[PDB]
Amino acid sequence: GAMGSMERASLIQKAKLAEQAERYEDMAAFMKGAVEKGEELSNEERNLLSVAYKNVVGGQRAAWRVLSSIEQKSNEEGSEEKGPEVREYREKVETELQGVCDTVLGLLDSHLIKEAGDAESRVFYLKMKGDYYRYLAEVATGDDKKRIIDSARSAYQEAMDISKKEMPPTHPIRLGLALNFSVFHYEIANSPEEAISLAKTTFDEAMADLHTLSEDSYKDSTLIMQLLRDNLTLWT
């Protein structure tokens, strides 16, 4: 693509510089170029990829929600007609969001997932797949909303099944995946009980495994377990 002429290593290096510069769109494009080199990503690179897009899409999601709330307010009784702009601009932000999600999903489908044989990679990419369908679900309102949700669900489920089989319950990817899948349940699938059961069980199974960990692994896991607890506290 645009990054076709840059060395894979240089893209990765630049992705890391963009991350330092908080230039996440650039980071994302560098990482996309790196993915598109066709080589599997190392753990670090997969996290670079994830960080880049999460940040890009997180800005678009936060924007979309701002615009969505504005738009919902203009749709209330007594709201003064302001014309199409709010909807137009929400749609613009939404479209751009969908296109980032489509791009990530496209990187996962071509060909990250199919080449990812290790649990850490495969779960990670499936989680990412769940996450980006989830972001699509967040803005979905059409005939495809159920299928988008189902795709998020199916990706998360396959990631959960592998993570459960192949990773310790404290594995940060397993924990992050469960955290997000729990959020998917709560806020996308209208299954707050499942969301809560998932976060509870995940937290408790991780708790029971902490003893196996070095101090640094302990810190990685407990960091994520705390996010599970924050949700549980929020949700209960």
């Binding site: 997000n180 959020v183 599970l228 929020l234 949700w235």
Partner: peptide, 6 residues
């Protein structure tokens, strides 16, 4: 306040 995802 916003639920966490990672």
């Amino acid at each position: 306040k916003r639920r966490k995802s990672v």
